[PDB]
């Protein structure tokens, strides 16, 4: 349940928090691109022709992060006599405000498909979704034609306050057909065989099968809904992930969802421990959590294993995640908190 | 032996200051949270609220808002729980207790009794 | 401001016999945990982030559910598992506790 209005058509968001590259006019600002509104000469409009650059852009800032799952667009409907709309555009985000990112589908598409008319409102479904803070709609035109927006983010709160979170690529596994078990989606960086600074399958909201190689998403690999490491790959015996958070933090529990299927290899971490930091110094908070997992476990449907987090007070935290099987695999990790 | 040694009884006559205290030990008692639960003989529990010792961060139930206030001694590694003017459905059993959520240790209580 | 409901407020069973209560959320809560008290005792913690058993807390027990329904399962009843049982709600404050489902034995 997360696809709420976030405040365009809903007036939430207040003007100041929406920006663009450039207006036509002062009836057409950004001002003017809430959806479904009739302010200013009805909508948002670049002053400069979209031409074969493609730099003129409108800005909302959601304030808080995000968790967007769905945008939808709209023409310069104006009274009924606006003929102006952007027919397909891209789309950026960013959390800190600094670092941009463009957004890319499960398929590697970047372009949307927009609208048709000025009066209709296009959905879209960000597959996979974006944690952002703001985010950036740059109209598209592919001839010279006067383009022209109306927008509306759907989402909810980003509550769980996951900046970011590090960790080793995702391996494959060559069983009969390639299962691919590497995070797909990751918007940050990753050099050498180490994810950082960046977000993606593993904080997107969507949770595994039992049986790892089959996906709910269409025209993917076998393995997509997982990011999987193997035993062998680590001689310590355990994967080990740093998460950030954006502020002082209580911590309850953290909720792992792993695939059990140990028939092919995959089965619960045997155990978890996790070290807290508050920031400031160069130490950990204290002794670590380190929480078993009673035993290996019979069936092989995906469970959640929660460990507990004692409401630790912290802004950092550095878990490792202990082999019980060849393979290791995980689809989502949720951490339930509150600020402090 | 993680331990949250209370005192077995407080008496104090009505609306006077009452202090009671729940002395910690077997582990870093800076970072655990200490937790008050109220519970009147054969009644059910009420959560109170807790503090968290290092950093002073607080949790107050609304109910018990202008009732009382908690603090922690990071000395002696106890942890208070103040109530400003005792009122008979103010005297019962007061337990504290460790943990957020999983309440994991529990002390043995102090019976509190309002009384002239 | 999400108060527990357990059922059955008060309930007797035979030994042997799987008995099983309930804790029902006004509102949706991430996890359930339970707590058992025997008369002049303080409470002891029982299960965690709604299944986990609580150190040394037999194998007969067990906890699930979700959003707003939750329960405490007993595979077979022994004489000492007479007790109250209270479900607690962590995910708001005030963080509250169920009314108790005090469970008598049968001899």
């Known amino acids: 349940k997360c696809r709420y209005a976030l405040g365009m058509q809903d007036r939430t968001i207040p003007d100041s928090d929406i920006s663009a590259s450039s207006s036509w006019s002062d009836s057409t600002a950004a001002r003017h691109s809430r959806l479904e509104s009739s302010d200013g000469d009805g909508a948002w409009c670049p002053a400069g022709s979209v031409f074969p650059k493609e730099e003129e852009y409108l800005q909302v800032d959601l304030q808080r992060l995000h968790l967007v799952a769905l945008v939808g667009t709209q023409g310069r409907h104006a009274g009924g006599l606006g003929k102006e709309f952007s027919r397909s555009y891209r789309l950026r985000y960013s959390r800190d405000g600094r670092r941009w990112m463009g957004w890319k589908d499960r398929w590697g598409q970047e372009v949307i498909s927009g609208n048709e008319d000025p009066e209709g409102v296009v959905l879209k479904d960000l597959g996979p979704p974006m944690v952002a803070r703001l985010v950036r709609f740059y109209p598209r035109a592919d001839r010279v034609m006067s383009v022209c927006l109306r927008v509306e983010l759907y989402g909810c709160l980003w509550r769980d306050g996951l900046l970011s979170y590090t960790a080793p690529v995702g391996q494959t596994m060559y069983l009969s057909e390639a299962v691919y078990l590497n995070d797909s989606t990751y918007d940050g960086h990753t050099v050498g065989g180490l994810q950082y600074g960046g977000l993606g399958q593993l904080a997107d909201g969507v949770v595994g099968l039992d049986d790892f190689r089959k996906s709910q998403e269409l025209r993917v690999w076998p393995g997509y809904d997982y990011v999987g490491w193997s035993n062998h790959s680590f001689s310590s015996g355990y994967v080990e992930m740093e998460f950030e958070f954006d502020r002082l933090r209580a911590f309850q529990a953290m909720q792992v969802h792993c695939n059990n299927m140990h028939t092919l290899g995959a089965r619960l971490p045997g155990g978890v421990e996790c070290r807290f930091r508050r920031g400031p110094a160069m130490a950990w908070e204290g002794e670590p959590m380190r929480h078993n997992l009673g035993g290996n476990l019979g069936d092989p449907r995906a469970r959640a294993v929660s460990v507990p987090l004692g409401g630790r007070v912290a802004r950092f935290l550095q878990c490792r995640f202990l082999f019980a099987g060849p393979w290791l695999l995980f689809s989502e990790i949720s951490f339930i908190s509150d600020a402090a | 032996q993680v331990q949250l040694q209370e005192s077995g009884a407080e008496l104090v006559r009505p609306g006077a200051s009452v202090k009671l205290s729940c002395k910690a030990s077997?582990?870093?008692?800076?970072?655990?949270?200490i937790n008050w639960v109220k519970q009147r003989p054969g009644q059910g529990l009420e959560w109170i609220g807790n503090?968290?010792?290092?950093?002073?961060?607080?949790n107050y139930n609304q109910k018990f808002k202008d009732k009382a206030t908690l603090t922690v001694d990071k000395s002696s590694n106890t942890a208070y729980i103040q109530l400003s003017s005792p009122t008979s459905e103010d005297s019962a059993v007061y337990y504290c207790?460790?943990?957020?959520?999983?309440?994991?240790?529990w002390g043995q209580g102090t019976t509190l009794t309002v009384s002239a | 401001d999400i108060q527990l409901t357990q059922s059955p407020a008060l309930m007797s069973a035979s030994p042997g016999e799987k008995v099983t209560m309930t804790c029902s959320a006004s509102?949706?809560?991430?996890?359930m945990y339970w707590y058992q008290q025997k008369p002049r005792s303080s409470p002891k913690p029982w299960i965690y982030?709604?299944?986990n058993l609580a150190s040394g807390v037999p194998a007969r027990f067990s906890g699930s559910g979700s959003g707003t329904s939750y329960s405490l399962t007993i595979s077979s009843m022994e004489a000492e598992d007479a007790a109250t049982y209270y479900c607690?709600?962590?995910?708001?404050?005030?963080?509250?506790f169920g009314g108790g489902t005090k469970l008598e034995l049968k001899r």
């Open positions: 207790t460790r943990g957020y959520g999983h309440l994991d240790y």
């Open positions: 077997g582990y870093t008692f800076s970072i655990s949270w």
């Open positions: 503090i968290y010792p290092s950093g002073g961060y607080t």
């Open positions: 509102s949706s809560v991430t996890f």
């Open positions: 982030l709604t299944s």
């Open positions: 607690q709600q962590w995910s708001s404050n005030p963080y509250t």
